[PDB]
Amino acid sequence: PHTYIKTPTYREPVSDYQVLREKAASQRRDVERALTRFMAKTGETQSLFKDDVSTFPLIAARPFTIPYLTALLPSEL
């Protein structure tokens, strides 16, 4: 049934809503964790615990000159 005839095959598609929700959720959580750890490590940092930069680093609070512009204005529109 293989000497003279050939038909193509494809890769296994994952159309499952559960695992797609899990993949998108975990990728969003991982990229936002990586972004916040990178921004807390390359700037001024605070800490809830004494000398705690590796675990739970906080980006330090900087004052704005005009705070209503960064508060009230929408960024995605």
Add this chain to the structure above:
Amino acid sequence: HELSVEQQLYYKEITEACVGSCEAKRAEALQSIATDPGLYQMLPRFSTFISEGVRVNVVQNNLALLIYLMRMVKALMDNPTLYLEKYVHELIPAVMTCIVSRQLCLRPDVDNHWALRDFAARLVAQICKHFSTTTNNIQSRITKTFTKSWVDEKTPWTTRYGSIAGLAELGHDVIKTLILPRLQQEGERIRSVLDGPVLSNIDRIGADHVQ
């Protein structure tokens, strides 16, 4: 298909941290790229950024930005979570361009293009150790480009240096069956070293580096 704002901001900060404002933010960005779990969905953007940035060396022969892009590739390879098998066809000619191109410098005489040569040669030996499969034929096709760039005359001493550097970082049997037949070429090199009519040219430093 379009990156969410979170990862769009992460892509912007990580790429602008590796352009050269300071070294510490660069080291933390490379330690981010090497050690994060979820950087897929941003691998094609990084591959496009790296390959186009190595292409932009032809308009501006910046050695420093090429060293930064090669350290970006070396950081991308050390990530255990992301698999570069689908995007290696873009990163192979970028590292190859950093190896076998002839002008890697803005001032050819003082810039150590030589290190971006052996660093990228070690990088391509790693990229064809981890990814060469008999369906791929990565290593045989890389050795063939290096070999026909080395055996062929008219090639500059910089690109011959890159060819010899990559071939010698591949391993011991490669230098047994590629380098050792053309050891007589050293005589053709020492033709222009021990006795050159023009001494103050730039061929002598490249020739004794090759030597």
Add this chain to the structure above:
Amino acid sequence: KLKLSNTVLPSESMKVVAESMGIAQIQEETCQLLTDEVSYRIKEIAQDALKFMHMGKRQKLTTSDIDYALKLKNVEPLYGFHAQEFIPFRFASGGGRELYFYEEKEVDLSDIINTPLPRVPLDVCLKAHWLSIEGCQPAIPENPPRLKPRSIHELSVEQQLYYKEITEACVGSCEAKRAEALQSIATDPGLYQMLPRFSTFISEGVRVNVVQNNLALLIYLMRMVKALMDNPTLYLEKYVHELIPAVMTCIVSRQLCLRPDVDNHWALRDFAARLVAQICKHFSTTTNNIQSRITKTFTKSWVDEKTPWTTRYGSIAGLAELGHDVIKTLILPRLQQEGERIRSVLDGPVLSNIDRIGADHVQSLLLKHCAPVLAKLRPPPDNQDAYRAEFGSLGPLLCSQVVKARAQAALQ
């Protein structure tokens, strides 16, 4: 452009024939008259014997074509003799004379009687097969040979199902299934373009199959390697860099499963591995890459002090099956070390380990190789106690093995 000429037989051969017959003092124009007449008759017959070649649908002029071309020109096909009366043999071909240029021109009349007659070949039979199935030629042995689009695997699903069936048959659950699958590997013409997946299945299998020393899994994989090698269609030396470290591991490795009992098979696992190893050094050979590399690894396996004796026995077998000269040049300066190892296993009481079994197998194999190595390069004189100059390992029993080899040579 055609520079066609008219080549005739030389006239200086025609005067030799004439003066060896009684016709002396012939002129050159008389002699040139002979060599254009007979060179025409050779050209007339060879053009007429080419008619029988084309009619018989052959491209080679056989010896019988000139027998029918002569009979067509009313000349007797007899070459050795000519019968004036013509009645004993009338235009009957005697098949020519089996004569040579480099012949002996004298034989003994009982040499022709005592030689065995050649085998009459098989009679003509009619087998049918398929050149074309609805336009496509099958690969049977009777035949000669922006989002990027979702890609397809380079194997068909009939090919992928074939690969799955052949691999699940080659792990040897049933023996008839194995044997067909092995013959299918041995003669499938279209087994290229599936060969990376077979080489990867072999290589990966042995390495995770020596984690627990599963002998059948290994004996089946070695038979799969042997079935891959004798297939004539596929190109193997692109994949031999995965094939060779798999077989070296079968030969030079320790056995994680029960040490004794299947050691008999273990010797065969090392027997099948050393067979395919020297077959791989026979093929695929270029300068100083494959054979010398496995020879160097076998020798540094041997000269290594205080080896595992399973590894020792396997490496001994591997260096043993390398041919005529290899044991002639390598096993020579090492007999004393082999004897000392045997003496240590003998002295230490420890019997529940595998050291004693390994020692006995190694000594027997080394003694058989030394026997012909001796039968091959010296006469069989003083076969009683001269071998005591070589520590007295095989001695008279080695001499008896040499005598058995001599008897086999006499039978040949």
Add this chain to the structure above:
Amino acid sequence: RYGPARLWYDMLGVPEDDLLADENFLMVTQLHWEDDIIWDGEPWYSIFPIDNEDLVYGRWEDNIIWDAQAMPRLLEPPVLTLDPNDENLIL
């Protein structure tokens, strides 16, 4: 211009929008396969994975820039193609 590599585009300021014999290269003659030998160690959908067609088939060697000034052909900006064959990408 606005896609990945926009930073490079902005920095540039562009605004539109016998030793070559086949055997030498066979990996039996170029690989220390001795290291592999293990000594004293201690289908309706595809069964096998699908390889990068561009790496397996394309001539990526044509994107190597051998000489910056003397470049045999003219290269063009590359658009992001987001291959969906790769898993780990949501779309």
